[PDB]
Amino acid sequence: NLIEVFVDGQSVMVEPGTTVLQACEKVGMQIPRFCYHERLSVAGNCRMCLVEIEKAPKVVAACAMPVMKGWNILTNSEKSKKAREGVMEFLLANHPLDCPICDQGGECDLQDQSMMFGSDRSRFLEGKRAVEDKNIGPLVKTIMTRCIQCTRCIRFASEIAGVDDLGTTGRGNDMQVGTYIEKMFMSELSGNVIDICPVGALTSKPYAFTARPWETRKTESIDVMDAVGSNIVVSTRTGEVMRILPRMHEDINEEWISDKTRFAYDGLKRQRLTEPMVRNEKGLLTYTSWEDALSRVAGMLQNFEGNAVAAIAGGLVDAEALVALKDLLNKVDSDNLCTEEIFPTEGAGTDLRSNYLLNTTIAGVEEADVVLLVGTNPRFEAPLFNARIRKSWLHNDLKVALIGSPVDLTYRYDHLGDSPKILQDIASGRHSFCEVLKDAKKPMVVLGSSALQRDDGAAILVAVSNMVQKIRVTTGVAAEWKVMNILHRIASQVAALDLGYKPGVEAIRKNPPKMLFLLGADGGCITRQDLPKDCFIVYQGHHGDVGAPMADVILPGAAYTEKSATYVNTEGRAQQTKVAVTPPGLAREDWKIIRALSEIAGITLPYDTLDQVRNRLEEVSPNLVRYDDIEETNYFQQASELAKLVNQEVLADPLVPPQLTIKDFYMTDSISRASQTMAKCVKAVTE
Amino acid sequence: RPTVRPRSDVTHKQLSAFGEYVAEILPKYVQQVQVSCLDELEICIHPDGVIPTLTFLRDHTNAQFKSLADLTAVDVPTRQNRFEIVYNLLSLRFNSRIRVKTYADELTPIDSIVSVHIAANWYEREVWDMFGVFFFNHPDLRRILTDYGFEGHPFRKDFPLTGYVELRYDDEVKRVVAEPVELAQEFRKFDLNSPWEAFPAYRQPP
Amino acid sequence: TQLITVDEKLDITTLTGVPEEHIKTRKVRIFVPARNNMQSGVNNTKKWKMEFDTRERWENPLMGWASTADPLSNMVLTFSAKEDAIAFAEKNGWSYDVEEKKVPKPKSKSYGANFSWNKRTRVSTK
Amino acid sequence: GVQVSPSGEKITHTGQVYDEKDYRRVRFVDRQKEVNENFAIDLIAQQPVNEVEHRIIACDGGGGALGHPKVYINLDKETKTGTCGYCGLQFKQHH
Amino acid sequence: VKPIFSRDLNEAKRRVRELYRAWYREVPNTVHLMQLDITVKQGRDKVREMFMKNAHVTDPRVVDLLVIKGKMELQETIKVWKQRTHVMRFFHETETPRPKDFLSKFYMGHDP
Amino acid sequence: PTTNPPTARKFIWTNHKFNVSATPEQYVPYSTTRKKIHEWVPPSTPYK
Amino acid sequence: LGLREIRVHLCQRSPGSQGVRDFIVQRYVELKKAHPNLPILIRECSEVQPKLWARYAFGQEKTVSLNNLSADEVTRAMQNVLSG
């Protein structure tokens, strides 16, 4: 099943069902594009891609044609270059000339194609059309005068964003693109409409006019704050964080990003800890130096020892910081290393890496038939897994089932119940969906980390594990296709479970520590009610919302754009944020602060460089130095035989995530709570 | 066509015949012959090739390339031998120009052409100060264009543009002293490479 | 001349004139740069590049300029192969972090599958 | 309108002012901080709106090649002053 | 690999010791004739410290190129081409060295 | 300008300030930007 | 002295880790039912040496490397690391 295709005399064997663009991308010649995104559907609208097809007198579009047999696509011919210069002349007939106004200065995809592919002088002397601007939202500023009507935004909002709101009204040059009525197009993934749009017609509103893409310097990092772990280009201008852009890696995020992590860059410059603060004798928090602050931490850490020195991590915390803090508290031998969000510790919490990961690969969500989802809203908690599940729901016949909290997704999802007892009903087998999964080949169940915040979270894990064991009884599946997997809403939770921090706050509520000190924790679960009176808490972190005004000595750490750090997604893949802008003033990196704390105490942590921290990471868990690789891992059968002996009971309440609607999606984990961009998002949504 | 510069093929065919002649006369000792567009002939030879190829071009009857224009490294870090040392010759009779290339790194030097061309007696000092390319048999090879103690050959691509050493007068020693460099404003480096294919004939294979 | 043979990894760490602070505390990257997402091009993604670790960039006390003490922060070095870039980083002595080229997988994009009789991949826009 | 700080510092029209404990004000003693009297924000409120009959207007800032490029402004939303993004001269439909 | 003038490490060390011989003859004439400030024992100690800075290398190619660089500094200090300030740039007395311990490097900035 | 005067605009200066270096009237430079990194203020009340 | 955290590093395709992979296949479950409070972490990595990093108290991390070690040898190693 191969076709001999000539591209200017080449000999490329391409599979059928392809395009002229996907034939020429194996050569390296790029036929110019505006309407065709690679990851959107084919719709020939912009007509820039016209090439000649070896001596047939009509030039054909590179979007629509399959190359049949032995065609020679003359990509650098007279007729194809006249077609490209003519279509660029017709695109720049009615384009209003706002290129010094425009946000896409160097990032215009049509400045570059007019500069390398169009003509020299326009013969237009008539008058351009002008289109009334819209009010789509406080994130997508839409100057629709310069829109080239290429319909790349309406296919994204109809197929992958799934909103059905952007479509074209009218005909001719009077055809204008956008919402016909005054509709606030504000969903998740509404910021990926901007980077899809090759024109600067609709662009970002918080990055309206602040910088320019030739001036900005483009570094690379991984995401935090949703646990999908997407690759991010941070574009920085003069040591200031200016854009966050998605970066292509086809497993984790295929040129998308969510609106939270692409407009929470403005959180990083507002309500940020810079200087170390110390509880004064009056009762306030006064700014001191590191030489006094870490000396007070060491003076209250040499006294309390053994077991009553604890730490709660959670949120935006590196997997290097947990290594340095885990050695820092294991040399004072207290294992009360807790987290913000609760994973159950009754059967194999920190052990056995198939009970808390995405054991199905995120590319392998496309290689599935039944996806059943218990608990969370995937549209809010990690939206890009829901983008992958919409791509798998579109491009092959994938059937969806959802248990608990009937919430409008981007599809129809076949809602079964609001209860955890129907997990036991499917595990025994009386429901119709047992016959539906018996009529299918590849299932996967997923179990988000907001149903595990409930009281019967271990009962939910035991019932879902026995249910998926009966699912593996019903379906003959391969051993390489693991079927039980868990998504998360906190990026540091999977890193703490890989490093062996005991999840939940079970150790804190069992033994109240004499000296807790919290590392970046801002979730509303822990306060001075389960704790003694003095208790000497540090906030070793950034963006003070809860954990810093209720603190004793504040140590300002760095953020996700601000250090060479290791973060793990739900897949088990750990990547490295590289440092883009250093943290302001006296704020340092988290492992740097913890190692200086160990130096100023009587402890001796064996670190002096970040590569030595990665060597200790190789010693403690050797998946977090291995980069851009989900390590293949197993032993779910021993986890199931381990958790079958756990005897727990669910109770009859409807399980529901805290992100029920979109009005509380836009405020999580102290960056979106602290910004004014996401405050404008909540203010726009709730009115 | 008044925009495009007009092309005469007679200089291209006589430079093709002369490059065929130089690759014929030195088969052990010429690697590549490139008669480019804009009608310049480039002859790329061995690091051992430089003394007898330039003696041939200086003293041959049809060559007569007596005057050497410049001796110049370019630093391409993606090669095994990073420095393309070029020698531009000039015929005072035949009105043409050979651009002789040769390859080097910093650890395999070239025999210098001071024994045949005394034009290059300062050009060797210029390229050894500039690129770290040592040359043999020189009278006094010396760093000349950077400072008396400027550690680091500056025109290598691994050298930064800003440098390492700044200078400042100090009243403590009552002399001009060297400091590690820090800048009042940074060098705002741009990304001016457009993402589209500029020239379809000059494309690398994947 | 006469030929010698030495079994040693070559290093020119002492003759580039670098300080000792800018050769042991640094980390370079060996990376294919990603395409800027509002653009749709290949010509940045084609060649390998070598950027350094981004050090600190404080505000100037006069007018808020980007004042820095790291002169290798503005350095980007183009390349053509990962093996030559790794050999350049070994021959200069900086520790590397190598990231592989994230090539796009070619999708099954057909115009005839946009208008189906039974499948859910129908486009309602046209 | 040039506003005044409690330290007496003129507020620059972009919104820049120095804080009362800032050490960067010591370049202003025995000298002066330059602030223009003609504020660019306040110099557009004196410009009247242009009542025109065109559905789409063309603006160049006056002079042709003297001012900004000849861009085209929609006037369909009568409740919003259709502005020129280069300049800021407000346009409005006659009906 | 085609080598530079010293074929092996023994001949390379022989030319290194000849260059150190020429520097040891070179230093008292430099301190007497430049109207210099340093002690001549401090100058010979600085020459020994600059040799021990680069003396952790194996390859005779880079040892012979360091001989070529040291011969350039040698001829620029014999023929009076490196001045008082250009000689005194090697000492770096305007700048205290960066602290090798972790705590003062933590305190003074973002230095790894 | 006695013969052909220039165009007079409403923002223009009616008196020429001369070149004014080493005078109390003096240009000195500054940042023309706001505080980009907003600090976190401590609360005015203690924890208990 | 007692033990706080067992830490088994595996390789999934190396032939020197077949005994410890078979031990985790057939008798990890009664080891967890004997000691449920102390965590026995299993971390897996391709082309790595099989390791038995045991953390006791005060940062004491004792290492056992178990390349080409069978099931009886790795259960003997687990027995004398549980005993002390």
Ligand code: SF4
């Ligand atoms: S999107 Fe339109 S207005 Fe903006 S730079 Fe491109 S051509 Fe100019």
Ligand code: SF4
């Ligand atoms: S708004 Fe952008 S993506 Fe949508 S049709 Fe217009 S140019 Fe295309």
Ligand code: FES
């Ligand atoms: S690129 Fe094919 S029609 Fe748009």
Ligand SMILES: [Zn+2]
């Ligand atoms: Zn105007």
